Ligand binder design. Structure first.
Ligand SMILES: NC(=O)c1ccc[n+]([C@@H]2O[C@H](COP(=O)([O-])OP(=O)(O)OC[C@H]3O[C@@H](n4cnc5c(N)ncnc54)[C@H](OP(=O)(O)O)[C@@H]3O)[C@@H](O)[C@H]2O)c1
Ligand code: SF4
Ligand code: SF4
Ligand code: SF4
Ligand SMILES: [Zn+2]
Lengths: 106, 89, 206, 176, 111, 147, 138, 54
């Protein structure tokens, strides 16, 4: 069995569990008062509970993905890169940038 | 009617002492047959019974929007906007 | 209504949740104005950070967009800030269309979308061609739709439709194709604009 | 919906391997591909020689422009500038003056064939049905000057096609 | 500051100098590789008259955009691109050309 | 005296027999030019051969729209052509810019680049009408070199 | 089966003309075919139909010898044939002299004209406006 | 066509008799549509890909 995409369908469990536990710590380094940490954490914790309850079932892969484990692993792989870029460039924690000129209607 | 060489059609001038026209020399210039609107006056005027009459070319098949023409004055017969056809009484 | 209405609003409140969710982060660096009409979402972005907005929506746990496919730009001389580069984004996993806009005049350079999106570099060349907006830290900025001996930027509303260099003769010189000739046929400028306002609610008080 | 293009290993063991190898060792499928054109050669070709035979058409077809007139003389074109503004190529030009006394129907009427992308828009926008698109193919010139149509005249010379136009418009009122 | 462009005031002037050297070396090379056309000396005179029209310098924002454009229209020869003595030719060949005088232009009657 | 007049027609008959056109895929017109190959309307081996080639071809069909980028490109093709050359401007774009015209990029007329002998007016130039362009070309060749 | 194919070709050559008639449909005409003919048109035009053969085909039709003043039999374009192009030629089902009659209005030309071409008496452009008048007199 | 005559031109038999039809025929041609203001993006599946009209 193999996925349709170029990413190889490898039989690996708990691989999703490592990456989802890693990203939670990165979020709790610099932003704390920001809403970015407060909202993303509760989605990841909801997804981690489904992995712990269901043992290698296709129904667990069907939850919020429905394209096997290979597509879900790609969602976790770029999550660490997105969290590190959000930690490096301050945007979520700080808001002080100038407002636009008053015009919008065409 | 023709002036010098070239024939006038639908009110058109040829050339003032031959200056503008030069291309139409080897090839013969076009001319519309009976473009003087002589066929407009050739058609006989139809008698009307009502005070206002509706005009049509030939129903919905031929392109003519319906216009009502008033007949009140004895002198000068009324004609529709699209046709040269005149109506009396 | 049976033929008069296209579709009734039902997903409008569902799409309005996105108008709150991204705004719940609340950056002055990113958010500014959020507009939602006719089953579609529109966001305009402050010039200082465009790349951090594009790294968002890419991946992300709540919404997965990935494809930052089609890229347009708007020329408008009404505002003090001229150009408006408009990103059209599409999701495959989520099935939704969101819009990313820029508000800056951008005669001065703007940040590129090449590190986030691969096909973005080809569209970025078109904006430099037609509009004349330079992208900072861009790999290979080359002319595509413009001529090799073309002056200015062909789309800008400041100059005519015919242009300055357009007519190309051959005549006297054996091989050299002409350029400096400028005359063209008369394009009839239509002044057709209807009296009375077209639609209510769209009217703005002076 | 899913349909799948991949065969996923047609050969398995012994019998299924040999026939998949036989088509690559010699040819077979090339000889089978040879037979496709073989029967295609025998069946009669659908060919039309133009100077004698003519191809299929329709009651409504757009070609070279020609302006129609009323059955009892009179030019049907009323001069509106209606067809002028609709024209996406801006091929049609119209300047109007009063005809002698009373009537007001045209003076300048040029349709460019250097322009004109053929829409039937001018046929549709016309309330009096002046420009009706006739079944035309024959038009070939030496110059642009000979190609672009003059002040009516050559358009009025469409009388040779107006007999067909009158037949075609009878299939046009209350559309098809 | 805002907005960056590439250089700040004095640094923008030296970017033009680097651009001038790259284009000065190509005009002898674009005779044998391209075509003879006019002259090597006359081609170098075409360079000086081009920079005279651009010579204003009030803000580095305007100068920086001219460098990017200068590394494009003058780059249409270095990496070998098709023109066939039609593109990248700046000088008018068929120009009349008109003059600015109240006796020369008024005799022809224009505007 | 009689042999001189009859031999001239024999050379003109050679071009009346076969004409090799250039396959320019620069248009929507080019898809209608591919309908000349389509069996229902054919000049294929009636006169037209789709081998083309920049040097061996006698005819070149300028298919539709030409931009200022293609203006030096199409000119050098015309120079590579042999002395008995005929140029057909098939399509309204080729005749003088059917659409666009007043646009900055599109070259008006084609005759500003390459001189035209036969004009075909049609946007989607119907294969029926396209058959005239080749038949008129064959008819136009009447007399060449008297002295 | 084999004998019927050879006999069908012999009947076609014997029907249309004979020895001189078959050569006119072979050398001048691109394809030789026999069937029902209307034979009613302006000048020397025949216009035949009713033949099955293939879909979207209405017999040989045949070009006219000396249509107006061309005086050509070897080479002829689609300049020939009067108002019948939208009739039995391609579009309509009814034949022009058999069922569906052409409408009379005394505006249409009685004699059919050929193509303009590069020959004299062809198409031309013409000015329309009388322009802005200017006059000076002693 | 759409029965509402502010978008699509009415029938040829209809416009010749009734009044409002021909005035709308006069204004749907020459003059455009009088469109509602706003930016919209549509994409319908092309066999090549998409036509993302904006
Ligand atoms: N560099 C020099 O050679 C030089 C130096 C000093 C001055 N010039 C002057 O510049 C001019 C150069 O012209 P050119 O020699 O380049 O012209 P050319 O090539 O001889 O061309 C003249 C054309 O006119 C036609 N023609 C002329 N007389 C004719 C006649 N009686 N009957 C029929 N056709 C006739 C010829 O057509 P056919 O071939 O079909 O008959 C020929 O194609 C000369 O008149 C000369 O006075 C030249
Ligand atoms: S062709 Fe029709 S729409 Fe155009 S000016 Fe004439 S009458 Fe009016
Ligand atoms: S067919 Fe189209 S382009 Fe041609 S004249 Fe009519 S409206 Fe204009
Ligand atoms: S004339 Fe029409 S079909 Fe031909 S290239 Fe132009 S737009 Fe396309
Ligand atoms: Zn009337």
């Amino acid at each position: 069995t193999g996925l349709v995409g170029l990413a190889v369908c490898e039989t690996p469990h708990e691989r999703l569990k490592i990456l989802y536990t890693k990203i939670l710590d990165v979020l709790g380094h610099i932003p704390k008062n920001a809403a970015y940490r407060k909202y993303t954490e509760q989605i990841t914790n909801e997804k981690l509970s489904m992995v712990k309850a269901e043992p290698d079932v296709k129904k667990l892969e069907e939850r919020l993905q429905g394209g096997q484990i290979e597509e879900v692993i790609l969602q976790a792989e770029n999550e660490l890169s997105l969290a590190r870029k959000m930690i490096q460039w301050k945007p979520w924690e700080p808001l002080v940038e100038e407002p636009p000129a008053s015009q919008w209607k065409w | 009617x023709x002036x010098x060489x070239x024939x006038x059609x639908x009110x058109x001038x040829x050339x003032x002492x031959x200056x503008x026209x030069x291309x139409x020399x080897x090839x013969x210039x076009x001319x519309x047959x009976x473009x003087x609107x002589x066929x407009x006056x050739x058609x006989x005027x139809x008698x009307x019974x009502x005070x206002x009459x509706x005009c049509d070319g030939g129903g919905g098949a031929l392109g003519h929007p319906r216009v009502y023409i008033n007949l009140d004055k004895e002198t000068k017969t009324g004609t529709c906007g699209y046709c040269g056809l005149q109506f009396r009484q | 209504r049976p033929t008069v209405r296209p579709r009734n609003d039902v997903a409008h409140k569902q799409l309005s949740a996105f108008g709150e969710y991204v705004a719940e982060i609340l950056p002055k660096y990113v958010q500014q104005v959020q507009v939602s009409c006719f089953n579609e979402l529109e966001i305009c972005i402050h010039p200082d950070g465009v790349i951090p907005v594009l790294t968002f929506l890419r991946d992300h746990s709540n919404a997965q967009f990935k494809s930052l496919a089609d890229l347009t730009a708007v020329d408008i001389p009404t505002r003090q800030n001229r150009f408006e580069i408009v990103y059209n984004l599409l999701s495959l996993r989520f099935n939704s269309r969101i819009r990313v806009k820029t508000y800056t005049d951008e005669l001065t350079p703007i940040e590129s979308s090449v590190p986030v999106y691969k096909a973005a570099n080809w569209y970025e060349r078109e904006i430099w061609d037609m509009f004349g907006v330079f992208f900072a830290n861009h790999p290979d900025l080359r002319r595509i739709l413009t001529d090799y001996g073309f002056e200015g930027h062909p789309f800008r509303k400041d100059f005519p439709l015919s242009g300055y260099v357009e007519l190309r003769y051959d005549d006297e010189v054996k091989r050299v194709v002409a350029e400096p000739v400028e005359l063209a046929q008369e394009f009839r400028k239509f002044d057709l604009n209807s009296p009375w306002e077209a639609f209510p609610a769209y009217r703005q008080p002076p | 919906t899913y349909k799948y293009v991949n065969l996923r290993e047609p050969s398995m063991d012994m019998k299924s391997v040999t026939d998949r190898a036989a088509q690559t060792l010699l040819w077979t499928e090339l000889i089978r591909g040879l037979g496709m054109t073989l029967s295609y050669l025998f069946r009669e070709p659908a060919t039309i020689n133009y100077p004698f035979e003519k191809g299929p058409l329709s009651p409504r077809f757009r070609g070279e422009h020609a302006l129609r007139r009323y059955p009892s003389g009179e030019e049907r074109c009323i001069a509106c500038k209606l067809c002028e503004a609709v024209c996406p190529a801006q091929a049609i030009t119209i300047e109007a003056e009063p005809r002698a006394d009373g009537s007001r129907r045209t003076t300048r009427y040029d349709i460019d064939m250097t322009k004109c992308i053929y829409c039937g828009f001018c046929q549709e926008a016309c309330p009096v049905d002046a420009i009706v698109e006739g079944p035309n193919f024959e038009f070939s010139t030496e110059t642009h000057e000979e190609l672009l149509y003059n002040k009516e005249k050559l358009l009025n010379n469409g009388d040779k096609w107006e007999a067909e136009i009158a037949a075609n418009i009878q299939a046009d009122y209350l559309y098809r | 500051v805002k907005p960056i462009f590439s250089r700040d005031m004095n640094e923008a002037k030296r970017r033009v100098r680097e651009l001038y050297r790259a284009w000065y070396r190509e005009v002898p090379n674009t005779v044998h590789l391209f075509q003879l056309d006019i002259s090597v000396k006359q081609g170098r005179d075409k360079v000086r008259e081009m920079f005279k029209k651009n010579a204003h310098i009030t803000d580095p924002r305007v100068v920086d955009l001219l460098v990017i454009k200068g590394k494009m229209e003058l780059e249409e020869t270095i990496k070998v691109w098709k023109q066939r003595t039609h593109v990248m030719r700046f000088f008018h060949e068929t120009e009349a050309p008109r003059p600015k005088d109240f006796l020369s232009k008024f005799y022809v009657g224009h505007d | 005296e009689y042999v001189v007049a009859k031999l001239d027609d024999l050379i003109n008959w050679a071009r009346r027999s076969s004409l090799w056109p250039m396959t320019f895929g620069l248009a929507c017109c080019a898809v209608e030019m591919m309908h000349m190959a389509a069996p229902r309307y054919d000049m294929d081996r009636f006169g037209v051969v789709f081998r083309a080639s920049p040097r061996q071809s006698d005819v070149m069909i300028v298919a539709g729209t030409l931009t200022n980028k293609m203006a030096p490109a199409l000119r050098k093709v015309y120079d590579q052509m042999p002395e008995p050359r005929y140029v057909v401007s098939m399509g309204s774009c080729a005749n003088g810019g059917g659409y666009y015209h007043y646009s900055y990029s599109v070259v008006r007329g084609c005759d500003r680049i390459v001189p035209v002998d036969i004009y075909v007016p049609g946007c989607p130039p119907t294969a029926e009408a396209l058959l005239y362009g080749i038949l008129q070309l064959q008819k136009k060749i009447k007399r060449e070199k008297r002295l | 089966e084999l004998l019927q194919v050879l006999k069908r070709g012999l009947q076609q050559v014997s029907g249309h003309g004979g020895l001189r008639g078959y050569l006119r449909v072979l050398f001048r005409a691109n394809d030789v075919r026999v069937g029902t003919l209307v034979g009613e048109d302006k000048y020397g035009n025949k216009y035949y139909e009713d033949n099955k053969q293939f879909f979207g085909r209405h017999r040989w039709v045949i070009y006219t010898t000396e249509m107006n003043g061309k005086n050509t039999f070897w080479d002829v374009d689609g300049s020939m044939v009067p108002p019948e192009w939208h009739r039995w030629l391609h579009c309509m089902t009814d034949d022009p002299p058999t069922v569906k009659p052409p409408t009379a209005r005394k505006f249409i030309w009685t004699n059919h004209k050929f193509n303009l071409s590069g020959t004299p008496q062809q198409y031309v452009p013409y000015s329309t406006t009388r322009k802005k008048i200017q006059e000076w007199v002693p | 066509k759409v029965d509402d005559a502010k978008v699509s031109p009415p029938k040829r038999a209809e416009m010749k008799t009734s009044m409002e039809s021909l005035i709308h025929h006069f204004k749907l041609y020459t003059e455009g549509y009088q469109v509602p203001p706003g930016a919209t993006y549509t994409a319908i599946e092309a066999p090549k890909g998409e036509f993302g009209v904006y």
